[PDB]
Amino acid sequence: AEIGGDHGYNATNIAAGQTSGAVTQIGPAVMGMVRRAIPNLIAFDICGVQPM
Amino acid sequence: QTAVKSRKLKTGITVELAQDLEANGFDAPNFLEDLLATEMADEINKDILQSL
């Protein structure tokens, strides 16, 4: 009687929302965004710093 | 004089369907109870109009 079904565990299907039962999903959620960290700088005070 | 008759309907779902139905926006209990009320009222028309 109208099983919920599930995604076929295929990244192709999961993003699009293609399901197996009824009520195909609107789409995934948004858990957030991860971006690469910013490397730190070695202070230039080791060598000469002469503003021109 | 005529004895009354009966019309009965039943749908049934699964908890998994109801759980993910909420995430798509639908009010899972209220939506389903609307379905039977819509179908039963609709199925009476197919009775009354065909009775005429």
From Swiss-Prot, chain A:
Lineage: superkingdom: Viruses
Stated role: Major capsid protein that self-associates to form hexamers, building most of the capsid in association with pentons made of the capsid vertex protein and one dodecamer of the portal protein. The major capsid protein self-associates to form 160 hexamers, building most of the T=13 laevo capsid. Folding of major capsid protein requires the assistance of two chaperones, the host chaperone groL acting with the phage encoded gp23-specific chaperone, gp31. The capsid also contains two nonessential outer capsid proteins, Hoc and Soc, which decorate the capsid surface.
UniProt signal peptide: none
Species of origin: Enterobacteria phage T4 (Bacteriophage T4)
Name of the protein described by the UniProt record: Major capsid protein
Family recorded in the similarity comment: Belongs to the Tevenvirinae major capsid protein family.
Subunit structure: Homohexamer. Interacts with the portal protein. Interacts with the capsid vertex protein that forms pentamers. Interacts with hoc; one hoc molecule associates with each capsid hexamer. Interacts with soc; this interaction reinforces the capsid structure. A total of 960 subunits of the major capsid protein forms the 160 hexamers.
Record PTM text: A proteolytic cleavage by the prohead core protein protease gives rise to the mature major capsid protein during virus maturation.
Curated annotation (Swiss-Prot), chain B:
This protein's name: Capsid vertex protein
Modification after translation (UniProt): Proteolytic cleavage at the N-terminus by the prohead core protein protease gives rise to the mature capsid vertex protein.
Chain's role: Capsid protein that self-associates to form pentons, building the capsid in association with hexamers of the major capsid protein and one dodecamer of the portal protein. The capsid vertex protein self-associates to form 11 pentons, building the T=13 laevo capsid in association with 160 hexamers of the major capsid protein.
Subunit annotation: Homopentamer. Interacts with the portal protein. Interacts with the major capsid protein that forms 160 hexamers.
Organism superkingdom: Viruses
Family under the similarity heading: Belongs to the Tevenvirinae capsid vertex family.
